[PDB]
Nucleic acid binder design. Structure first.
Ligand SMILES: [Ca+2]
Ligand SMILES: [Ca+2]
Ligand SMILES: [Cl-]
Ligand SMILES: [Cl-]
Ligand SMILES: [K+]
Lengths: 96, 106, 86, 98, 98, 83, 103, 96
DNA sequence: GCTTTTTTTTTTCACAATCCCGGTGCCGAGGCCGCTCAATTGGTCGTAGACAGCTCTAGCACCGCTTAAACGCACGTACGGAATC
C-alpha cells in the first residue's frame, strides 16, 4: 500500500454537512481547506509556544491557546473562537 | 469502554490527533490536557465559518460542490477572514470583480 | 543524459499573456515599455523562489524539486500558497 | 464595417478574466522557463509536475496583484496607461526593490 | 528686510532633521496619548518608562518611513506637496488598509 | 477647551518635523489630521497586543518587552529595548 | 574552552544550551552551536568593524546607535538582512529627492 | 539580589577589541548589538528547526545551520558566513 | 443683443456579444470495505507551577522654576490644477 498521508478531510466533510447538508467539495477545494487548518495550527501553536517561553513556562496550556487566539484572530472571529474553545473545554472537563 | 476525546468535547475535529501534533511539533516540553481540545475547537469553528460562506457562494454560483473560486469569493468578500488570510494565496481562486471607477465609460 | 540544456524561454511569456494578467488586475490601457519590464520582474520572482526551493531539495539530498520544496520556499518569501500540500 | 471604440474590448477582457481563474500563461513556455532558471542553481534536476503548477499559480498571482498596485499608481498620477515607473513605485513602496 | 523664499527653510529643516536622531514628538503629550489609548483595553495600567520610549521610537520610525513613501507618491503625481491621497495610496500599497 | 483628546497633543510642529526627517518639503494642511488618524491606528494595534501580553503575564505594569514582543508580531521588530 | 577550541569569542557552551531548551528540535548535533556561534560572531564583527569606522569618521571613540544605523544602511547586504528592523536612536540617511533641490 | 539577566555583551566587547581595539561603545549601542544577535540566532534556529522538521529528522546538526544560513543571509554575506562556520567546525573537530 | 456655427444631446435601427436553457457524456466525488497503526485505557512517578509570604524597586504624584517650543497672525510667492492644444 502507499505510505499513510494524514489529512483533516474527514473532519472538513463532517463540518460541511453540519453547515450545508445539501453541499459537497472538490478535490482541490478540500486541499485548500487542508492548507488552511495546517496554516492556522502552525500560527496558533507558534504564538502559544512564544507566550509560554516569554513567561518562563514549560507547558502550553489552554490559557496560552486562548491568548494566542486573541493575538491572531480578527475581532468577532476571535470572540466566537474564544467562546467555542471555552465551551468545548468545559464540556470535556465535566465529562472527565 | 473507548470514547474518543473529540466526542467528550462535542467536537468533530480530532483532539487525539491535535494533542499529538503539539507534543511532536517542537512547540514546548509539556502540553496541558485542555490545550488540544481548545485548539481543535478553534480550528473547527474557523473551518465551519469558511464552509458556511464558501457554500453560500457555491449556491449563489448555482452549483452543489465547493471549488477554489467559492472559497476565494467567500474569503475576500468577508472583512475579517480576508485580514486573517491577507498574505495567503488560494490556488485556482482568481480575483473579485473589481473595475476602478475612472476606467469606465462616460 | 539524452539532451536537456535550455534555450531563451523568457520570450515564451508572450505579450498576449502579460496583457491577460494585467487584464485580471483590472488594467485598461498598457504602455509599450511594460512587457519587457514585466519579464524582468517575473524572472526575479522565479529566480528567488526557485533558488530557495532548490535549496530545500539539495538539503533533503533529492534531485527532484517537490511541490513542498516550492510551498516551503513560498512561505519563506511571505507568499504562502494553499492547495499543494503542507 | 463595425469597429469597437478603444477601451471597450479591454473592459470586456477585464470582465472576462476577473470572472475566471484558469492560468493565463501558456503552460509549457512557463515550464521551460522554470527549468532554464533552475539550471543556474543546480543541473539535471527533475521537478514534480505539481511543483511546476504550484510555481505558475504563485507567479500569476504575484504579477496579477502587482498589476493592481501598478494600476492605482497610474491613476494616482491622473493616467490610465500603466507605465514602467508605475510598477517601480509599486515595488519600491512594497519594498521588493531599493 | 531679509526674507527666504518658500521651501528654502524646508530644505534646511530636512538636512537638519536627517542629520539628527532625537525624538521629534514631545515626550509628555506622547505619553498622555499612550495612557489614553491603553485605557480602552485595560484600566489602572502602569507603564515602565522604557515601555513608552519603546512605543515612541516605534511610532516616529513608522511615521518617518510612511512620509518617505508618501513623498514618493506625491512626486509620482508630478507634485511637490504631500496630501492625504498620497499617504492613503502608500498605505494601500503597503497592504496596511484594504 | 484644552480637554482629554490627547491625540491633539501631537502638534503640527512635531508632525512637520517627522515628515522633514522623511524628506518632505511642502505639506498640505489636511495632512496633520490624516497623520493623527494613522498614528492612532498604529498605537491601538501595537498597544492592544502589548497589553494582551501584559494580561497573560498576570501583571498591571506594561513592560518594554511586552512592546518589543508586540512590535515583532506587527512586523515592526525594534532593536535596543530587550530584543 | 570550547569557544577557544573553535577560534571564537562567542560562547559555544551557552549557544548549545539555548538550542536544546529553545524548542527547536528534540536533539542538537555537536557541530550546530559551534557553527552557530561562528556565524553570529562573523556578523557581529562586520557591523562593529563598519560602525567603529563611522565613529572614527566622526572623531568619536565610542560607537553609538547612529554609527550602527550608518554602518548598516550603507551596506547593500546588511540593509537587506535588517530591512524590516528599526534601530532606536539610529536616525535616517541624509537624502533629499532630486526634484525638490533648487534650480 | 536584582534578578540576574544574561546577555551577549561581554562577547560583543571582545569582538570589538579584535576589529578596533581603541574604540568603545554606549549602552544604547550595546543594547542594539544584543537585540541584533538574539534576532538572527532565533532566525537561523527557527529555519533549522523547520528544515529538520520537513525532513523527519530529530537532530538539528551543523548542516541544518548551514542550509538555514544560505536561506537567511544575502549572497555575498552567506558566502563568508558559511566559510567561517565551516572553518570554525573544522578547527573544533581538529582540536579534539 | 444677434446671426452663424460648433458643441452637446437625442433618437433610430443594425450587430455583436453575452446570457440562459436542455441535451449529452465522462470522470472524480462519495462511499463502502477490510485491515492497521495510532488514540485510548489504566496505571505509575516526578516535578512544574500555583500559592503565601516578604523585599524593595521603580512607578506615580506633586511642586516650582526656566526656558524652548507652540501659537496666532500678517503677508505674499510658488504651487496645484484647470483649460487648451
Ligand atoms: Ca446552515
Ligand atoms: Ca455520486
Ligand atoms: Cl490545559
Ligand atoms: Cl552537528
Ligand atoms: K519552535
Amino acid at each position: 500500500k502507499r505510505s499513510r498521508k494524514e489529512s483533516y478531510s474527514i473532519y472538513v466533510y463532517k463540518v460541511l454537512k453540519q453547515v450545508h447538508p445539501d453541499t459537497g467539495i472538490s478535490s482541490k477545494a478540500m486541499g485548500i481547506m487542508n492548507s488552511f487548518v495546517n496554516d492556522i495550527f502552525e500560527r496558533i501553536a507558534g504564538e502559544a509556544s512564544r507566550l509560554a517561553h516569554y513567561n518562563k513556562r514549560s507547558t502550553i496550556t489552554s490559557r496560552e491557546i486562548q491568548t494566542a487566539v486573541r493575538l491572531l484572530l480578527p475581532g468577532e472571529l476571535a470572540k466566537h473562537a474564544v467562546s467555542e474553545g471555552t465551551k468545548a473545554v468545559t464540556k470535556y472537563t465535566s465529562a472527565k | 469502554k473507548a470514547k474518543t476525546r473529540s466526542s467528550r468535547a462535542g467536537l468533530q475535529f480530532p483532539v487525539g490527533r491535535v494533542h499529538r501534533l503539539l507534543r511532536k511539533g517542537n512547540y514546548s516540553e509539556r502540553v496541558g490536557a485542555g490545550a488540544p481540545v481548545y485548539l481543535a475547537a478553534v480550528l473547527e469553528y474557523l473551518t465551519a465559518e469558511i464552509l458556511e460562506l464558501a457554500g453560500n457562494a457555491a449556491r449563489d454560483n448555482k452549483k452543489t460542490r465547493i471549488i477554489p473560486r467559492h472559497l476565494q469569493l467567500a474569503i475576500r468578500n468577508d472583512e475579517e477572514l480576508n485580514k486573517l488570510l491577507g498574505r495567503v494565496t488560494i490556488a485556482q481562486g482568481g480575483v473579485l470583480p473589481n473595475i476602478q471607477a475612472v476606467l469606465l465609460p462616460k | 543524459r539524452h539532451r536537456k540544456v535550455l534555450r531563451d524561454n523568457i520570450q515564451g511569456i508572450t505579450k498576449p499573456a502579460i496583457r491577460r494578467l494585467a487584464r485580471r488586475g483590472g488594467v485598461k490601457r498598457i504602455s509599450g515599455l511594460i512587457y519587457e519590464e514585466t519579464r524582468g520582474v517575473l524572472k526575479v520572482f522565479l529566480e528567488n523562489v526557485i533558488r530557495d526551493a532548490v535549496t530545500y531539495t539539495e538539503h533533503a539530498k533529492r534531485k527532484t524539486v517537490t511541490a513542498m520544496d516550492v510551498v516551503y520556499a513560498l512561505k519563506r518569501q511571505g507568499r504562502t500558497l494553499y492547495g499543494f500540500g503542507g | 464595417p463595425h469597429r469597437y471604440r478603444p477601451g471597450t474590448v479591454a473592459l470586456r477582457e477585464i470582465r472576462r478574466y476577473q470572472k475566471s481563474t484558469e492560468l493565463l500563461i501558456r503552460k509549457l513556455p512557463f515550464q521551460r522557463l522554470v527549468r532554464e532558471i533552475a539550471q543556474d542553481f543546480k543541473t539535471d534536476l527533475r521537478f514534480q509536475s505539481s511543483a511546476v503548477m504550484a510555481l505558475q499559480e504563485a507567479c500569476e498571482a504575484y504579477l496579477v496583484g502587482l498589476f493592481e498596485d501598478t494600476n492605482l499608481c497610474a491613476i494616482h498620477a491622473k493616467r490610465v496607461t500603466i507605465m514602467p515607473k508605475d510598477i517601480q513605485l509599486a515595488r519600491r513602496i512594497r519594498g521588493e526593490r531599493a
